[PDB]
Structures are given as C-alpha cells and as structure tokens.
C-alpha cells in the first residue's frame, strides 16, 4: 500500500512537471472555470496521499483524484479508447489523461486541511517531494502541534509510513520522550525532529536485503534491545510498545 501509488505520481511528474499547459480540459461542467485559469500554468509536483494523487499546479490550484476503482492516468505525447476522459493537462511534448475516475475535484489552499479524505491520511515520508519543511508546518500546525509524539507517530493522518519500529528510533535521535508536543519545542529541536522524520524512514528502505551472514548498515538502537545499554550514555534501554534510553532521553 506503498510502494504502488508513488509510482503514479513519478509517470505524471515525469511526464509533465515544470512543464508549461497548452492546453487544460475538464469534462466536468464544476471544473470548467479552470481551464483558461491553467493555460500557461505548470504542475509543480504530485504528492501522495494514500491511494489519492494531488496533482500541484503553479498557481496554487490543486487538482486531488482518487481513482478508486476504475480511475487510470495514461501518459502520451501530445497528439494521440472505450473509457471516458475526464481530466487532459496537456503540454508541448507530453500530455497526461484521466481516465474513468469519478472522484475528482479542484482545491484551494486552504481546502486541503478540511478535505475529508486528506485529513485522514498525510504525506509518505518516503515521498521525496515532502520536505523537512512541510512537516514542520505540519507538526506547529493547530491540528497536531498539542498532540504528544507517543500517538502522533503512530496515526496515519500525520505522516504515512511511519511504523512502530520507526517512532522510537526518531524520538532517540532527537533525545524526546513519547510525552512531548511540537508546541513545547524549540525551534533547534523542531528542526531536528523535522529531518529525523525523514532521513530515518528513507534510511530504512533504501537498505536491508541476510542478517544471517550480514548486518545492515542500518541498525537498531532502541527497537527492542531493551534490556541492553545505550550507545551514548550507557543505560539500559527500556519498554513499555515504546523503546527508550530513561538515560538520555527526556
Ligand atoms: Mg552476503
Ligand atoms: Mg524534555
Ligand atoms: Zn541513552
């Protein structure tokens, strides 16, 4: 439930990003009035959020889809089939087509954060698109910053791709007890919480084959190993299931 999806998102950004619209069409009558409004306009990205894309354009319109059952995005090259088109952002070379998807709307910045199906599910921390600076945001913003990391790193509408196994290597890189807020952070320790996010999850995946006859090069410093002393400060690391140096980590 990973992996797939954020291969979409790459075949349009690919496809189409940076790129100026030459052309922009719509086949439902509510979307109409954006058209003339994209001609000249660029997709700055696509992000991921669960099985939805949000297609980002220049002038700060998102156009959000979720394909659901029979929803496919076609790639092709400006000029070129028994499924209806719904959505066609075309460029001079490329020109991407919706087709099917019935789920399909465009958003306002301020939209997003009420959007009932993007309140329940956030960005992939493996989305190379989402930067240390969105999740800042994320976490000061009103809807997160009073929620203790213990809950937070485990739900889903915060970040996806955030399992167990990862929210106690973050909070012992950061020195964070699972009792904090982002709204009791300096911004020296938001920051590294932001990075620590990011670069532990994407330093996971891009690793791992084994271990019978090779140790990754990332390993574990608190997931499990309870029991066991801590690299830095030397204390033994407990449970709870949260992983945690009492030692250095408060
Ligand atoms: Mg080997
Ligand atoms: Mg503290
Ligand atoms: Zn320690």
């Not at 922009?24 to 700055?44: C, D, E, N, R």
């Not at 209806?84 to 460029?91: D, G, N």
């Not at 913003?141 to 970040?159: I, M």
Request: with cysteine; proline share 5%; glycine share 6%.
């Amino acid at each position: 439930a990973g992996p797939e999806i954020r291969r979409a998102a790459d075949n349009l950004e690919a496809a189409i990003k940076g790129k100026p619209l030459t052309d922009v069409w719509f086949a439902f009558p509510q979307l109409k009035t954006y058209q003339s409004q994209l001609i000249g306009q660029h997709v700055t990205h696509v992000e991921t959020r669960g099985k939805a894309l949000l297609t980002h354009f220049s002038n700060d319109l998102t156009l959000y889809s979720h394909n659901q059952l029979y929803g496919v995005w076609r790639v092709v090259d400006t000029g070129e089939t028994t499924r209806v088109l719904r959505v066609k952002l075309q460029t001079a070379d490329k020109t991407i087509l919706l087709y099917s998807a019935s789920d399909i709307e465009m958003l306002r910045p301020e939209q997003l954060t009420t959007h009932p199906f993007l309140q329940r599910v956030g960005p992939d921390v493996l989305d190379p698109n989402l930067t240390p600076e969105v999740v800042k945001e994320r976490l000061l913003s009103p809807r997160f910053r009073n929620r203790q990391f213990a809950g937070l790193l485990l739900d889903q509408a915060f970040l996806a791709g955030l399992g167990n196994y990862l929210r106690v290597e973050i909070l012992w890189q950061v020195g964070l007890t699972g009792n904090h807020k982002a709204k009791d952070l300096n911004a020296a320790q938001l920051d590294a919480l932001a990075h620590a996010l990011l670069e532990i999850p994407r330093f996971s995946y891009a690793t791992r084959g084994e271990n019978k006859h090779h140790g990754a090069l990332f390993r574990f410093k608190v997931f499990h190993r309870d029991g066991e002393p801590c690299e830095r400060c030397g204390s033994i690391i407990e449970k709870t299931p949260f992983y945690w140096c009492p030692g250095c980590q408060h």
